[PDB]
Coordinates of C-alpha atoms and ligand atoms in Angstrom, one line a residue:
Chain A
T1 CA -7.9 -71.1 2.9
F2 CA -9.2 -71.7 -0.6
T3 CA -7.9 -68.6 -2.2
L4 CA -6.2 -69.3 -5.5
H5 CA -2.8 -67.8 -5.9
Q6 CA -2.1 -67.3 -9.6
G7 CA -0.4 -64.4 -11.3
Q8 CA -1.7 -62.9 -14.5
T9 CA 0.7 -63.6 -17.3
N10 CA 1.8 -60.5 -19.3
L11 CA 0.0 -60.9 -22.6
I12 CA 1.5 -57.6 -23.9
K13 CA 5.0 -59.2 -23.8
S14 CA 3.3 -62.1 -25.7
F15 CA 2.0 -59.9 -28.4
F16 CA 5.3 -58.2 -28.8
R17 CA 7.2 -61.4 -28.8
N18 CA 4.9 -62.8 -31.5
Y19 CA 5.4 -59.6 -33.5
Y20 CA 9.2 -59.4 -33.4
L21 CA 9.2 -63.2 -34.1
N22 CA 8.0 -62.5 -37.7
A23 CA 8.4 -58.8 -38.2
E24 CA 10.9 -57.7 -40.9
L25 CA 12.7 -54.7 -39.4
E26 CA 14.1 -51.9 -41.7
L27 CA 17.8 -52.3 -41.0
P28 CA 20.8 -50.5 -42.5
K29 CA 23.3 -52.5 -44.6
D30 CA 26.2 -51.3 -42.4
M31 CA 24.5 -53.1 -39.5
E32 CA 27.7 -54.5 -38.1
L33 CA 28.9 -50.9 -37.5
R34 CA 26.0 -49.7 -35.4
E35 CA 25.4 -50.0 -31.7
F36 CA 21.9 -51.3 -30.8
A37 CA 20.1 -50.4 -27.6
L38 CA 16.8 -51.4 -26.1
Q39 CA 14.6 -50.6 -23.1
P40 CA 13.2 -53.8 -21.7
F41 CA 9.9 -54.2 -20.0
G42 CA 9.9 -53.5 -16.2
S43 CA 13.3 -51.7 -16.6
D44 CA 13.7 -48.0 -16.9
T45 CA 17.4 -48.4 -17.8
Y46 CA 18.6 -49.3 -21.4
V47 CA 20.5 -52.4 -22.4
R48 CA 23.1 -50.6 -24.6
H49 CA 26.4 -51.5 -26.4
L50 CA 24.9 -54.4 -28.3
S51 CA 26.1 -55.2 -31.8
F52 CA 24.6 -57.6 -34.3
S53 CA 25.4 -58.4 -37.9
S54 CA 22.2 -60.1 -39.2
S55 CA 18.5 -59.6 -38.9
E56 CA 18.4 -63.1 -37.5
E57 CA 21.0 -62.4 -34.8
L58 CA 18.9 -59.4 -33.7
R59 CA 15.7 -61.4 -33.9
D60 CA 17.0 -64.2 -31.7
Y61 CA 18.3 -61.8 -29.1
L62 CA 14.9 -60.2 -28.9
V63 CA 12.6 -63.3 -28.9
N64 CA 15.0 -65.3 -26.7
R65 CA 17.3 -63.2 -24.7
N66 CA 15.8 -59.7 -24.1
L67 CA 12.4 -58.4 -25.3
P68 CA 12.4 -54.7 -26.1
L69 CA 9.5 -52.4 -25.0
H70 CA 11.5 -49.8 -27.0
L71 CA 14.2 -50.7 -29.6
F72 CA 16.7 -48.5 -31.3
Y73 CA 20.2 -48.3 -33.0
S74 CA 22.7 -45.5 -33.1
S75 CA 22.6 -43.1 -36.0
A76 CA 26.4 -43.1 -35.8
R77 CA 28.5 -45.6 -37.6
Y78 CA 31.4 -47.1 -35.5
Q79 CA 34.2 -49.6 -36.0
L80 CA 33.6 -51.2 -32.6
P81 CA 29.9 -50.7 -31.9
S82 CA 30.4 -52.7 -28.8
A83 CA 33.3 -50.7 -27.3
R84 CA 32.6 -48.8 -24.1
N85 CA 34.9 -45.8 -24.6
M86 CA 34.2 -43.2 -27.3
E87 CA 37.9 -43.3 -28.2
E88 CA 37.7 -47.1 -28.8
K89 CA 34.4 -47.1 -30.6
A90 CA 35.8 -44.9 -33.3
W91 CA 33.0 -42.7 -34.8
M92 CA 33.2 -42.4 -38.6
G93 CA 30.0 -40.7 -39.7
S94 CA 26.4 -40.3 -38.6
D95 CA 23.1 -40.0 -40.4
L96 CA 21.1 -36.8 -40.7
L97 CA 18.1 -36.7 -38.5
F98 CA 15.0 -34.5 -37.9
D99 CA 12.1 -35.1 -35.6
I100 CA 8.9 -33.1 -35.3
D101 CA 8.9 -31.5 -31.8
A102 CA 5.5 -32.8 -30.7
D103 CA 6.0 -31.5 -27.2
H104 CA 6.1 -28.0 -28.5
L105 CA 3.6 -28.5 -31.3
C106 CA 0.5 -30.1 -29.6
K107 CA 0.2 -29.5 -25.8
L108 CA -1.8 -32.7 -24.9
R109 CA -4.0 -33.4 -21.9
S110 CA -2.5 -35.5 -19.1
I111 CA -4.0 -37.0 -16.0
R112 CA -2.7 -38.5 -12.7
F113 CA -4.8 -41.0 -10.8
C114 CA -4.5 -44.0 -8.5
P115 CA -4.9 -47.3 -10.4
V116 CA -6.5 -48.7 -7.2
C117 CA -9.2 -46.2 -6.1
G118 CA -9.2 -44.7 -9.6
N119 CA -9.1 -41.2 -8.2
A120 CA -7.1 -38.1 -9.2
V121 CA -3.8 -37.6 -7.3
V122 CA -1.5 -34.7 -7.6
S123 CA 1.4 -36.5 -5.9
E124 CA 3.2 -39.5 -7.2
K125 CA 1.8 -41.9 -4.5
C126 CA -1.6 -42.6 -3.2
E127 CA -1.6 -42.2 0.6
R128 CA -4.9 -44.1 0.9
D129 CA -3.8 -47.2 -1.0
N130 CA -0.1 -46.5 -0.6
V131 CA 0.4 -47.2 -4.4
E132 CA 2.3 -45.2 -7.0
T133 CA 0.0 -43.0 -9.1
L134 CA -0.2 -43.3 -12.9
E135 CA -0.4 -40.8 -15.7
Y136 CA -2.4 -40.7 -18.9
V137 CA -1.6 -38.4 -21.8
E138 CA -4.4 -38.2 -24.4
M139 CA -2.9 -38.1 -27.9
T140 CA -5.3 -36.6 -30.5
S141 CA -5.5 -36.7 -34.3
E142 CA -5.7 -33.0 -34.3
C143 CA -2.2 -33.1 -33.0
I144 CA -1.1 -35.7 -35.5
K145 CA -2.3 -33.4 -38.3
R146 CA -0.2 -30.6 -36.9
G147 CA 2.9 -32.8 -37.1
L148 CA 2.0 -34.0 -40.5
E149 CA 2.0 -30.4 -41.7
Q150 CA 5.5 -29.7 -40.4
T151 CA 6.7 -33.0 -41.8
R152 CA 5.3 -31.9 -45.1
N153 CA 7.2 -28.5 -45.0
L154 CA 10.2 -30.4 -43.7
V155 CA 10.4 -32.8 -46.6
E156 CA 10.0 -29.7 -48.9
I157 CA 13.0 -27.8 -47.4
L158 CA 14.9 -31.1 -47.5
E159 CA 14.2 -31.9 -51.1
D160 CA 13.8 -28.4 -52.6
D161 CA 16.6 -26.5 -50.8
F162 CA 19.2 -29.2 -50.0
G163 CA 18.2 -31.4 -52.9
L164 CA 18.3 -34.4 -50.5
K165 CA 16.0 -37.5 -50.6
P166 CA 14.3 -37.7 -47.2
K167 CA 12.4 -40.7 -45.7
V168 CA 9.5 -40.1 -43.4
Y169 CA 8.5 -42.4 -40.6
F170 CA 5.7 -42.4 -38.0
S171 CA 7.4 -41.8 -34.6
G172 CA 5.2 -44.7 -33.5
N173 CA 3.5 -42.5 -30.9
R174 CA 3.2 -38.7 -30.9
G175 CA 4.7 -37.6 -34.2
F176 CA 7.1 -38.2 -37.1
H177 CA 10.8 -38.7 -37.8
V178 CA 12.5 -37.7 -41.1
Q179 CA 15.8 -39.2 -42.0
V180 CA 18.4 -38.8 -44.8
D181 CA 20.6 -41.8 -45.3
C182 CA 23.5 -39.7 -46.4
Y183 CA 26.8 -41.5 -46.5
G184 CA 28.8 -39.0 -48.6
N185 CA 31.0 -36.3 -47.1
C186 CA 27.6 -35.4 -45.6
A187 CA 27.8 -38.1 -42.9
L188 CA 30.8 -36.3 -41.5
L189 CA 29.1 -33.0 -40.8
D190 CA 30.3 -31.7 -37.5
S191 CA 27.7 -31.1 -34.8
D192 CA 28.1 -27.3 -35.4
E193 CA 27.5 -27.6 -39.2
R194 CA 24.5 -29.8 -38.2
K195 CA 23.3 -27.0 -35.9
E196 CA 23.5 -24.8 -39.0
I197 CA 21.2 -26.9 -41.0
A198 CA 18.9 -27.2 -37.9
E199 CA 18.6 -23.4 -37.6
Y200 CA 18.0 -23.1 -41.3
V201 CA 15.2 -25.7 -41.3
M202 CA 13.9 -24.0 -38.1
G203 CA 13.9 -20.7 -39.9
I204 CA 16.1 -19.2 -37.2
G205 CA 18.4 -16.6 -38.8
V206 CA 16.0 -16.5 -41.8
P207 CA 14.6 -13.1 -42.6
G208 CA 11.1 -12.4 -43.8
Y209 CA 10.9 -11.6 -47.5
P210 CA 8.1 -9.0 -47.8
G211 CA 8.1 -8.6 -51.6
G212 CA 9.1 -12.1 -52.7
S213 CA 6.9 -14.3 -54.9
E214 CA 5.4 -17.5 -53.7
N215 CA 7.6 -18.9 -56.5
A216 CA 10.9 -17.6 -55.1
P217 CA 13.4 -20.5 -54.5
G218 CA 14.2 -20.9 -50.8
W219 CA 13.0 -19.0 -47.8
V220 CA 12.2 -16.2 -50.2
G221 CA 9.2 -18.0 -51.7
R222 CA 8.6 -20.1 -48.6
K223 CA 8.2 -17.2 -46.3
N224 CA 5.7 -15.6 -48.7
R225 CA 3.9 -18.9 -48.8
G226 CA 2.9 -18.8 -45.1
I227 CA 5.7 -21.1 -43.8
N228 CA 7.9 -19.4 -41.2
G229 CA 10.0 -22.2 -40.0
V230 CA 9.7 -26.0 -39.3
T231 CA 9.1 -27.0 -35.6
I232 CA 11.7 -29.6 -35.0
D233 CA 13.8 -30.7 -31.9
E234 CA 17.2 -29.3 -32.9
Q235 CA 18.9 -31.5 -30.2
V236 CA 18.1 -34.5 -32.4
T237 CA 19.7 -33.0 -35.4
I238 CA 22.8 -31.4 -33.8
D239 CA 23.5 -34.6 -31.9
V240 CA 26.1 -36.6 -33.8
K241 CA 25.6 -39.6 -31.5
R242 CA 21.8 -40.4 -31.4
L243 CA 19.6 -43.4 -31.2
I244 CA 17.3 -44.1 -34.2
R245 CA 14.3 -46.1 -33.0
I246 CA 14.4 -48.9 -35.6
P247 CA 11.8 -48.7 -38.4
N248 CA 9.2 -51.5 -38.0
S249 CA 9.8 -51.8 -34.3
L250 CA 6.8 -51.4 -31.9
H251 CA 6.6 -48.2 -29.8
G252 CA 6.5 -49.2 -26.2
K253 CA 4.1 -46.4 -25.4
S254 CA 1.5 -47.3 -28.1
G255 CA 2.3 -50.7 -29.4
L256 CA 2.1 -49.0 -32.8
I257 CA 4.5 -49.8 -35.6
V258 CA 7.3 -47.4 -36.5
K259 CA 5.9 -47.4 -40.0
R260 CA 7.3 -45.5 -43.0
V261 CA 5.0 -42.9 -44.7
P262 CA 5.5 -42.8 -48.4
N263 CA 2.6 -40.4 -49.1
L264 CA 2.0 -37.9 -46.4
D265 CA -1.5 -37.4 -47.8
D266 CA -2.6 -40.9 -47.4
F267 CA -1.4 -41.3 -43.8
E268 CA -4.3 -42.0 -41.5
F269 CA -4.1 -42.3 -37.7
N270 CA -6.1 -45.5 -37.2
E271 CA -5.9 -48.7 -35.2
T272 CA -4.4 -49.9 -38.5
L273 CA -1.0 -48.7 -37.3
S274 CA -1.1 -51.7 -35.0
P275 CA 0.0 -55.1 -36.3
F276 CA -2.2 -56.9 -33.8
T277 CA -5.4 -58.8 -34.7
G278 CA -7.9 -60.5 -32.4
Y279 CA -9.8 -59.0 -29.5
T280 CA -8.9 -58.4 -25.9
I281 CA -10.8 -58.0 -22.7
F282 CA -9.8 -54.8 -21.1
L283 CA -10.2 -53.7 -17.5
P284 CA -10.2 -49.9 -17.1
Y285 CA -8.5 -48.4 -14.1
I286 CA -10.7 -45.4 -14.2
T287 CA -14.0 -44.1 -15.7
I288 CA -12.9 -41.7 -18.6
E289 CA -14.0 -40.4 -22.0
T290 CA -11.2 -39.8 -24.5
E291 CA -10.1 -40.0 -28.1
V292 CA -8.1 -43.1 -28.8
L293 CA -6.5 -43.7 -32.2
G294 CA -8.9 -41.2 -33.7
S295 CA -12.1 -42.2 -32.0
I296 CA -13.8 -41.5 -28.7
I297 CA -14.0 -44.3 -26.2
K298 CA -16.0 -44.3 -23.0
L299 CA -14.4 -46.2 -20.1
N300 CA -15.9 -47.1 -16.8
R301 CA -13.6 -48.2 -13.9
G302 CA -14.1 -51.9 -13.2
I303 CA -16.4 -52.7 -16.2
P304 CA -14.6 -55.1 -18.5
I305 CA -14.8 -54.4 -22.2
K306 CA -14.1 -56.5 -25.3
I307 CA -12.2 -54.3 -27.7
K308 CA -9.9 -54.9 -30.6
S309 CA -6.3 -55.9 -29.7
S310 CA -5.0 -52.7 -31.3
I311 CA -6.9 -50.4 -28.9
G312 CA -6.5 -53.0 -26.1
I313 CA -2.7 -53.0 -26.1
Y314 CA -2.7 -49.3 -26.8
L315 CA -5.0 -48.3 -23.9
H316 CA -3.0 -50.7 -21.7
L317 CA 0.4 -49.2 -22.5
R318 CA -1.1 -45.8 -21.9
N319 CA -2.0 -46.6 -18.3
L320 CA -5.8 -46.7 -18.5
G321 CA -6.2 -50.3 -17.5
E322 CA -5.0 -53.9 -18.2
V323 CA -5.5 -56.4 -21.0
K324 CA -6.9 -59.3 -18.9
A325 CA -7.4 -61.7 -21.8
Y326 CA -7.1 -62.3 -25.5
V327 CA -9.4 -63.7 -28.2
Chain B
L1 CA 45.2 -13.7 -64.9
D2 CA 47.7 -11.1 -63.8
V3 CA 50.6 -12.6 -61.8
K4 CA 51.6 -9.0 -61.4
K5 CA 48.5 -8.5 -59.2
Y6 CA 48.1 -12.0 -57.7
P7 CA 51.7 -13.0 -56.9
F8 CA 50.7 -16.1 -55.0
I9 CA 49.5 -17.5 -58.3
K10 CA 53.2 -18.1 -59.4
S11 CA 55.5 -20.6 -57.6
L12 CA 58.6 -19.1 -56.0
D13 CA 60.8 -21.7 -57.8
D14 CA 59.3 -20.9 -61.2
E15 CA 60.3 -17.3 -60.5
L16 CA 63.8 -18.2 -59.2
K17 CA 64.4 -20.1 -62.5
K18 CA 64.7 -16.9 -64.6
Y19 CA 67.7 -15.9 -62.4
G20 CA 69.8 -19.0 -62.9
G21 CA 70.0 -22.5 -61.6
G22 CA 70.1 -23.5 -58.0
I23 CA 69.2 -19.9 -57.4
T24 CA 67.9 -19.6 -53.8
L25 CA 65.7 -16.8 -52.5
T26 CA 68.4 -15.9 -49.9
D27 CA 70.9 -15.8 -52.7
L28 CA 68.9 -13.1 -54.5
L29 CA 68.1 -11.4 -51.1
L30 CA 71.7 -11.3 -50.1
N31 CA 72.5 -9.5 -53.4
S32 CA 69.3 -7.6 -54.0
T33 CA 69.2 -4.0 -52.5
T34 CA 65.5 -3.0 -53.0
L35 CA 63.8 -6.3 -52.1
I36 CA 64.5 -6.5 -48.3
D37 CA 63.5 -2.9 -47.9
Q38 CA 60.3 -3.2 -49.9
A39 CA 59.4 -6.1 -47.6
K40 CA 60.3 -4.1 -44.5
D41 CA 58.1 -1.3 -45.7
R42 CA 55.1 -3.6 -46.2
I43 CA 55.6 -5.1 -42.7
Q44 CA 55.6 -1.6 -41.4
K45 CA 52.6 -0.3 -43.3
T46 CA 50.8 -3.0 -41.4
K47 CA 52.6 -2.7 -38.1
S48 CA 51.3 0.9 -38.3
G49 CA 47.9 -0.1 -39.8
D50 CA 48.0 1.6 -43.2
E51 CA 46.7 0.5 -46.6
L52 CA 49.1 -2.0 -48.3
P53 CA 50.2 -1.0 -51.7
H54 CA 49.1 -3.3 -54.6
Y55 CA 51.8 -5.5 -55.9
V56 CA 51.6 -4.0 -59.4
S57 CA 53.3 -0.9 -58.0
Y58 CA 56.5 -3.0 -57.7
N59 CA 59.2 -3.9 -60.2
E60 CA 59.5 -7.5 -59.0
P61 CA 56.1 -8.2 -57.4
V62 CA 56.4 -12.0 -57.1
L63 CA 59.8 -11.7 -55.6
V64 CA 58.6 -9.0 -53.2
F65 CA 55.7 -11.2 -52.2
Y66 CA 57.7 -14.2 -51.2
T67 CA 60.3 -12.0 -49.5
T68 CA 57.8 -10.3 -47.2
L69 CA 56.5 -13.8 -46.4
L70 CA 60.0 -15.1 -45.7
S71 CA 60.6 -12.1 -43.5
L72 CA 57.4 -12.6 -41.5
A73 CA 58.6 -16.2 -41.2
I74 CA 62.0 -15.0 -39.7
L75 CA 60.5 -12.3 -37.5
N76 CA 58.5 -14.8 -35.4
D77 CA 55.5 -12.6 -34.6
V78 CA 52.3 -14.6 -34.7
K79 CA 50.5 -11.4 -33.9
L80 CA 52.2 -9.8 -36.9
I81 CA 51.7 -12.7 -39.3
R82 CA 48.0 -12.6 -38.5
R83 CA 47.9 -8.8 -38.6
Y84 CA 49.6 -8.9 -42.0
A85 CA 47.5 -11.6 -43.6
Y86 CA 44.4 -9.5 -42.8
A87 CA 45.8 -6.3 -44.2
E88 CA 47.1 -8.3 -47.2
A89 CA 43.9 -10.0 -48.0
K90 CA 42.0 -6.7 -47.7
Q91 CA 44.3 -5.3 -50.3
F92 CA 43.7 -8.1 -52.8
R93 CA 40.0 -7.6 -52.3
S94 CA 40.1 -4.2 -53.8
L95 CA 41.8 -5.7 -56.9
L96 CA 39.2 -8.4 -57.3
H97 CA 36.4 -5.8 -57.1
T98 CA 37.5 -4.9 -60.6
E99 CA 38.2 -8.4 -61.9
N100 CA 36.4 -10.3 -64.7
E101 CA 34.0 -13.2 -64.1
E102 CA 36.2 -15.8 -65.7
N103 CA 39.1 -14.4 -63.7
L104 CA 37.3 -14.4 -60.4
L105 CA 36.3 -18.0 -61.2
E106 CA 39.9 -18.9 -61.8
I107 CA 41.4 -17.6 -58.6
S108 CA 38.7 -19.6 -56.8
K109 CA 39.8 -22.9 -58.5
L110 CA 43.4 -22.0 -57.7
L111 CA 42.4 -21.1 -54.2
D112 CA 40.5 -24.5 -54.0
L113 CA 37.0 -23.1 -53.9
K114 CA 34.3 -25.1 -55.6
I115 CA 32.3 -22.1 -56.9
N116 CA 30.9 -22.2 -60.4
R117 CA 28.4 -20.5 -62.6
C118 CA 24.8 -21.7 -63.0
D119 CA 21.5 -20.6 -64.5
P120 CA 21.2 -17.5 -62.3
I121 CA 18.1 -17.0 -60.1
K122 CA 16.2 -13.8 -59.9
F123 CA 13.8 -12.7 -57.2
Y124 CA 12.2 -9.5 -56.0
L125 CA 14.1 -8.1 -53.0
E126 CA 12.5 -5.4 -50.8
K127 CA 15.7 -3.6 -49.9
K128 CA 16.5 -2.9 -53.6
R129 CA 12.8 -2.3 -54.2
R130 CA 13.9 -4.3 -57.3
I131 CA 14.6 -7.8 -58.6
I132 CA 18.0 -9.2 -57.5
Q133 CA 19.9 -12.1 -59.1
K134 CA 22.6 -14.6 -58.2
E135 CA 24.7 -16.6 -60.7
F136 CA 27.3 -18.2 -58.6
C137 CA 26.5 -21.4 -56.7
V138 CA 28.5 -23.6 -54.3
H139 CA 27.2 -26.9 -53.0
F140 CA 25.8 -26.5 -49.5
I141 CA 28.2 -29.1 -48.0
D142 CA 31.3 -27.2 -49.2
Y143 CA 29.7 -23.8 -48.4
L144 CA 29.4 -25.0 -44.8
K145 CA 33.1 -25.9 -44.9
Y146 CA 34.2 -22.6 -46.4
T147 CA 32.2 -20.5 -44.0
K148 CA 33.0 -22.6 -40.9
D149 CA 34.9 -19.8 -39.2
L150 CA 33.4 -16.7 -40.6
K151 CA 30.7 -14.3 -39.3
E152 CA 26.9 -14.4 -38.9
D153 CA 26.4 -12.8 -42.3
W154 CA 27.5 -16.1 -43.9
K155 CA 25.2 -18.2 -41.8
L156 CA 23.3 -20.6 -44.1
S157 CA 20.0 -19.3 -42.7
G158 CA 20.4 -15.8 -44.2
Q159 CA 21.5 -17.6 -47.4
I160 CA 19.7 -18.6 -50.6
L161 CA 20.0 -22.3 -51.4
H162 CA 18.2 -24.2 -54.1
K163 CA 18.5 -27.8 -55.2
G164 CA 21.5 -28.4 -53.0
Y165 CA 23.4 -25.3 -54.1
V166 CA 23.9 -22.1 -52.3
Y167 CA 23.5 -19.1 -54.6
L168 CA 26.0 -16.2 -54.4
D169 CA 26.5 -12.8 -56.0
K170 CA 29.8 -11.3 -57.2
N171 CA 30.3 -9.4 -53.9
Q172 CA 29.7 -12.6 -52.0
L173 CA 32.0 -14.7 -54.2
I174 CA 34.8 -12.1 -53.7
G175 CA 34.4 -12.0 -49.9
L176 CA 34.7 -15.8 -50.0
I177 CA 37.9 -15.6 -52.2
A178 CA 39.3 -12.9 -50.0
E179 CA 38.8 -15.3 -47.1
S180 CA 40.8 -18.2 -48.6
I181 CA 43.5 -15.8 -49.7
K182 CA 43.9 -14.6 -46.0
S183 CA 44.4 -18.3 -45.1
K184 CA 46.5 -19.2 -48.1
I185 CA 49.1 -16.7 -46.9
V186 CA 49.4 -18.1 -43.4
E187 CA 50.0 -21.5 -45.1
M188 CA 52.5 -20.1 -47.7
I189 CA 54.8 -18.9 -44.9
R190 CA 55.5 -22.5 -43.7
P191 CA 57.6 -23.8 -46.6
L192 CA 59.9 -20.8 -46.3
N193 CA 60.5 -21.3 -42.6
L194 CA 61.6 -24.8 -43.7
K195 CA 65.3 -24.5 -44.6
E196 CA 68.1 -22.8 -42.7
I197 CA 68.9 -19.1 -43.4
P198 CA 72.2 -17.2 -43.4
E199 CA 73.0 -15.2 -40.3
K200 CA 73.7 -12.2 -42.5
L201 CA 70.3 -12.4 -44.0
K202 CA 68.7 -12.8 -40.6
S203 CA 70.3 -9.6 -39.1
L204 CA 69.4 -7.7 -42.3
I205 CA 65.6 -8.3 -42.0
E206 CA 65.6 -7.8 -38.3
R207 CA 67.0 -4.2 -38.2
Ligands
ZN1 ZN1 -6.0 -44.6 -4.2

């Protein structure tokens, strides 16, 4: 009779909006030739076949039209980025991509619970509260280090063997993505030739080099240096048509920037990878103890907490609770 | 470079020149006695599957080369054209295995391969129980092009690339050259199939 009916406004979308409103995305010069895609909030399906030709155009679409939880752009260069049929689009080159296969590399801990009763469910729905269960995957800094290794080795093979000039970027969540902005006859490498490079970098056909000095020049030295192949997801590399999550965008699963690492050594996995400032009141769904952004956090179901926005947004997008308010 | 060994080096028309003006291959063929038969033999030695005789063993190598191509063209046997080009390239290999460095490097350029010399790289191999060294290097992009339809042995993974370049040894370089030659042939047959030939010449090469 006196029950107040008021819906909690999504602050997360606010944060993102504010971010994208002033963020300066790392965009290719051949912007007009690339198809942009985006996964919106509350929608599992992508909003593809977009095509802009100015940072501003892109900015406005995001802040005004559709807000991206995840935002990318095709690696491939087209003549009609907006076309719907591959024949009409007209592919004419694609960038060279590599991505540390974090799924294979780390093996992280996941949990399935019911946001309501905060209990562990095995099924996707909670019979008791008739609600869909959630899943939490604890991403550790031990794992980020593993990826940073492979990225190191990758940049080596890339610069040392192929004499290329790679650019490293934090995946924004679980790992890294290395990319070569090759426009030469390179950009035209067929998927099969690409698959060649992929297997090379993965140390597939590569033999061991029992004698070999650590100073050999190629797999010869490398093998004798302990390195036996980089752990990448070939599919990313062999795929001529692929979506490059735009550098400087926020990763929908962490709220962390897709930052570019210039010195693999300096890279630290902090809450510093989040552009957000203030503080946020967080309401945990469950009582849990886990590492978050390289620090253990104890959470009790129900007990509000006043944490930094960074962790706040993070924990929220990771399904551990909700960001009830901001300060 | 010995045109006597690598006929394909010389253009048919440059050869036809020394016989007069407006001289057409068929014209010579129609009047030559040995040529057509020398070709027929070659096409046989393969049809059977026997080593093909080097071109230096001939009196008019270049003319014999283009004649066996023109015959293959007329015969209309894809299976044979392919069968021939393999046996042919094999033969040329043998010759190269005795060629100079500068010479090997020249046929490549002619054959359109971007292989050059570079400050060779040496490294201890365990199969030779001794240090091995490569001096020929192609750029990885090209190398991928050239080896697109070859075997696993050529797979970039088993290769040795450094600073963008794939390092090769003489034996490798040769195998690569041998490969383009094999293709060069299939391609050289087209321009001959171009114009119309005399019924008399046809029947001659068909018997
Ligand atoms: Zn429940």
